[PDB]
């Protein structure tokens, strides 16, 4: 389908400059200049956060009214009576709350140490990749997971480099890609677990490119649906109801509600004769597209 390398910069500029929209607030702790290597934080991304609700704010259950009511107010000496007197929802869970995405990936660390054969190619008519060596002779087992682990990034030029890296390696991969699948599930799941729209819309297009990059990749991926579909089930019904308003935004890929539908159709297309039930098990709303 459409590429992911070019669209990203123009989108970010259109969003931040043209509209009054926010970046919004990408944490850049530990990262200084382009020269000093960052200090990788021990935290992990897409991590479920504990419940912060207080002790007492929890309402108590009244045995007499069958209702959760808030506790009464303890007296206070300042608030004493004077002469005149004539007179609970539960704490919501962060289902759609963007998890914290620290810059402590492995791609950033490897690129900092300078072990990658990539570089930006400004001599092209746009941002392109420039390889120090030949792609089709690389060790995919060592490099391909590293490149997937940089998809979660948001700081330039790391995310551009990472997306363009996987985009170019999947084209020339061929058979060299199939045995690497068991090592790609963790970074894919970690990128999806961030709840952030930018990384999610990127990884879904990369996942499409992944199933299309070679043959027999579909059946090989099928056993791993239980670890990548759980997020699909959330944003499957995040669409825009414009009515008569034509969607100019359709020029680029931003609507998850159908970026997920296309990807699920593609999974059922390539998975074989049993991918449909493995999909229907995770996302129940799905409908067979054959």
């Amino acid at each position: 389908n459409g590429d992911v390398a070019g669209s990203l910069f123009t989108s970010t500029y259109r969003n931040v400059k043209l509209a009054g929209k926010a970046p919004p607030a990408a944490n850049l702790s530990g990262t200084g200049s382009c020269f000093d290597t960052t200090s990788l934080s021990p935290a992990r991304a897409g991590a479920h956060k504990a419940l912060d609700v207080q002790k007492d704010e929890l309402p108590v259950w009244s045995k007499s009214t069958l209702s959760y009511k808030y506790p009464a107010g303890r007296p206070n000496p300042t608030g004493f009576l004077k002469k005149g007197d004539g007179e609970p929802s539960p704490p919501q869970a962060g289902a759609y709350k963007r998890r914290e995405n620290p810059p402590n990936t492995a791609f950033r660390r490897f690129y900092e140490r300078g072990d990658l054969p990539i570089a930006v190619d400004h001599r092209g008519s746009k941002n392109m990749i420039a390889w120090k060596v030949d792609i089709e002779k690389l060790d995919y087992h060592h490099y391909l997971p590293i490149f997937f682990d940089g998809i979660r990034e948001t700081q330039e030029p790391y995310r551009f480099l990472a997306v363009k890296g996987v985009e170019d390696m999947l084209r020339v991969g061929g058979s060299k890609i199939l045995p690497v699948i068991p090592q790609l599930i963790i970074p894919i799941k970690t990128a999806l677990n961030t709840r952030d729209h930018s990384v999610m819309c990127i990884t879904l297009q990369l996942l499409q490119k992944l199933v299309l990059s070679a043959d027999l990749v579909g059946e090989a991926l099928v056993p791993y649906y239980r670890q990548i579909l759980p997020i699909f089930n959330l944003y499957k019904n995040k669409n825009k109801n414009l009515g008569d308003g034509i969607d100019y935004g359709q020029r680029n890929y931003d609507c998850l509600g159908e970026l997920i539908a296309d990807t699920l159709a593609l999974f059922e297309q390539k998975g074989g004769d049993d991918a449909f039930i493995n999909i229907k098990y995770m996302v129940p709303t799905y409908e067979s597209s054959v």
């Binding site: 020269f35 000093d36 290597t37 900092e112 140490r113 072990d115």
Partner: protein, 187 residues
């Protein structure tokens, strides 16, 4: 430390020839002595450390603990004279998983025994001057089945005469080595 530096072909951590070779090294002596003398075979200066109780007289590469020597070059090469005494040295390594292994090589040991955090191994030193090269990336793979990331600390115990300590990033030949990074034994 040594982070955000440039290591591509060589990285010399210690050199006997210089205004102050133990810039970054910490030195601890209990019943020994460290000095710089002119060797006879290789007619130049060599930094010698000696003393009884090998396990107590040594020099650590980072000046102080809680400070790592971030270096990602695979091969590590030392240039040492063999005084026919007890000599040992240790190198700590960070694996791909966040676990700090450490390998040490001793000339008074006869068996290798892999352990969760340590790997002691014998060293069969030659006579007189010799350079010893450690793969330091085959070793981690052969011991714990993991990958090498970057060295953290280096430590050299007593009864030896040091001339060169340098990371190589690959096994260079006697030809490819520059003049300073080789053994030219005169007559």
């Amino acid at each position: 430390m040594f982070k955000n530096a440039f290591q591509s072909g060589f990285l010399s951590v210690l050199y006997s020839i210089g205004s102050k070779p133990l810039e970054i090294w910490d030195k601890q002596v209990s019943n020994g002595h460290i000095k710089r003398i002119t060797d006879a075979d290789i007619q130049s200066s060599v930094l010698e450390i000696m003393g009884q109780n090998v396990s107590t007289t040594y020099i650590t590469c980072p000046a102080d603990p809680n400070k790592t020597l971030g270096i990602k070059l695979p091969f590590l090469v030392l240039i040492i004279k063999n005084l026919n005494k007890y000599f040992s040295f240790e190198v700590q390594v960070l694996d791909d998983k966040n676990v700090r292994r450490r390998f040490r090589a001793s000339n008074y040991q006869s068996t290798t025994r892999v352990k969760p955090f340590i790997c002691t191994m014998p060293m069969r030193l030659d006579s007189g001057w010799n350079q010893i090269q450690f793969n330091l990336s085959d070793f981690t793979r052969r011991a714990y089945g993991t990958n090498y990331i970057e060295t953290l600390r280096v430590q050299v115990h007593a009864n030896c005469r040091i001339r060169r300590i340098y990371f190589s990033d690959r096994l260079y030949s006697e030809e490819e080595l520059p003049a300073e990074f080789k053994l030219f034994l005169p007559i």
